[PDB]
């Protein structure tokens, strides 16, 4: 009943993973994912990201998820499963 993704390759998983969507309902999940969304948009609140820099933002973004995944510091079960289920289908689409 909500929005759809922008990339069809990604939208595929989002529609084909109920276990992923159930996790995304949790505000604890939703919150931590918003933390990283800030990063892919900008490294600073001045601006950043003109015609590059985004590949660098990739790192800073992973830096966050590294603390959210299995064996992190403030890792969450729904985030652990979130990344697992997500990447699961992302690797299961690779031919």
């Amino acid at each position: 009943m909500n929005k759809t993704l922008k990339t069809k390759a990604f939208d595929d998983i989002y529609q084909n993973s109920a276990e992923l969507q159930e996790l995304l309902k949790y505000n604890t999940v939703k919150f931590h994912l918003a933390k990283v969304y800030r990063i892919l948009s900008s490294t600073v609140n001045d601006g950043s990201s003109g015609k590059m820099n985004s590949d660098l933002q990739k790192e800073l973004a992973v830096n966050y998820l590294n603390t959210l995944r299995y064996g992190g510091i403030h890792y969450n079960e729904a985030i652990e499963e979130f990344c697992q289920i997500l990447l699961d289908k992302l690797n299961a689409v690779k031919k």
Partner: protein, 40 residues
């Protein structure tokens, strides 16, 4: 470290990114929820 193991994380990032771009990442936190996440 610049581009960690596999490209899963890479896809994960833009995935979550698309969520917030269309309005799937929008949320609301109660006082209790803010205490456990922000700590205050």
């Amino acid at each position: 470290g610049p581009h960690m193991f596999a490209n899963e994380n890479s896809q994960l990032l833009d995935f979550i990114r698309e969520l917030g771009d269309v309005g799937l990442l929008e949320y609301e936190l109660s006082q209790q929820e803010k205490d456990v996440l922000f700590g205050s």
